[PDB]
Amino acid sequence: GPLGSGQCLYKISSYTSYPMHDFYRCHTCNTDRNAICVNCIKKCHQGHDVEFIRHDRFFCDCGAGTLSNPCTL
Amino acid sequence: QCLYKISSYTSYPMHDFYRCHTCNTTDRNAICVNCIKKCHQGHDVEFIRHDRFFCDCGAGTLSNPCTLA
Ligand SMILES: [Zn+2]
Ligand SMILES: [Zn+2]
Ligand SMILES: [Zn+2]
Ligand SMILES: [Zn+2]
Ligand SMILES: [Zn+2]
Ligand SMILES: [Zn+2]
Ligand SMILES: [Zn+2]
Numbered sequence: 001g002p003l004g005s006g007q008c009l010y011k012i013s014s015y016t017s018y019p020m021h022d023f024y025r026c027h028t029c030n031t032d033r034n035a036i037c038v039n040c041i042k043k044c045h046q047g048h049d050v051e052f053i054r055h056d057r058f059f060c061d062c063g064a065g066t067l068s069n070p071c072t073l
Numbered sequence: 074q075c076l077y078k079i080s081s082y083t084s085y086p087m088h089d090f091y092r093c094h095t096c097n098t099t100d101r102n103a104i105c106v107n108c109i110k111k112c113h114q115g116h117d118v119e120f121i122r123h124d125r126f127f128c129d130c131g132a133g134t135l136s137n138p139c140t141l142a
Contacts, residue, residue, distance in 0.1 A: 072108075
């Protein structure tokens with residue numbers, strides 16, 4: 001298998017999957033964008049207009065090449 | 074004071090990034106501090122701080138009170 005595909009945890013995928021977290025935004029309660037935990041979104045905002053959001057602490061749209069201009073770094 | 078205290082735990086799980094409203098072809102983008110300075114100089118940028126465990130609902134910041142407290 002490719003390098004980094006073993007089952008020892010000292011491998012790249014352990015580090016790149018680690019700094020992620022998920023939360024919800026409720027657009028029904030609004031306009032300053034809020035952040036809501038999963039338990040509250042399911043119980044406190046049942047039937048509301050909700051949005052799932054996943055954050056990667058180190059992800060950068062600029063360096064990732066998703067913006068109109070290429071990253072200068 | 075000793076660092077083994079509640080405030081150490083409550084300050085730890087935070088991270089910050091920038092949104093560039095000038096570069097709006099990617100909606101709700103996330104940009105690092107180095108890129109916002111060198112790649113988006115003069116753009117309409119917004120600093121955003123997030124706490125992994127913060128919840129506006131439980132915090133009482135929304136119109137209705139939280140039902141899970
Ligand atoms: Zn909550
Ligand atoms: Zn709501
Ligand atoms: Zn950049
Ligand atoms: Zn970047
Ligand atoms: Zn920009
Ligand atoms: Zn976050
Ligand atoms: Zn709640």
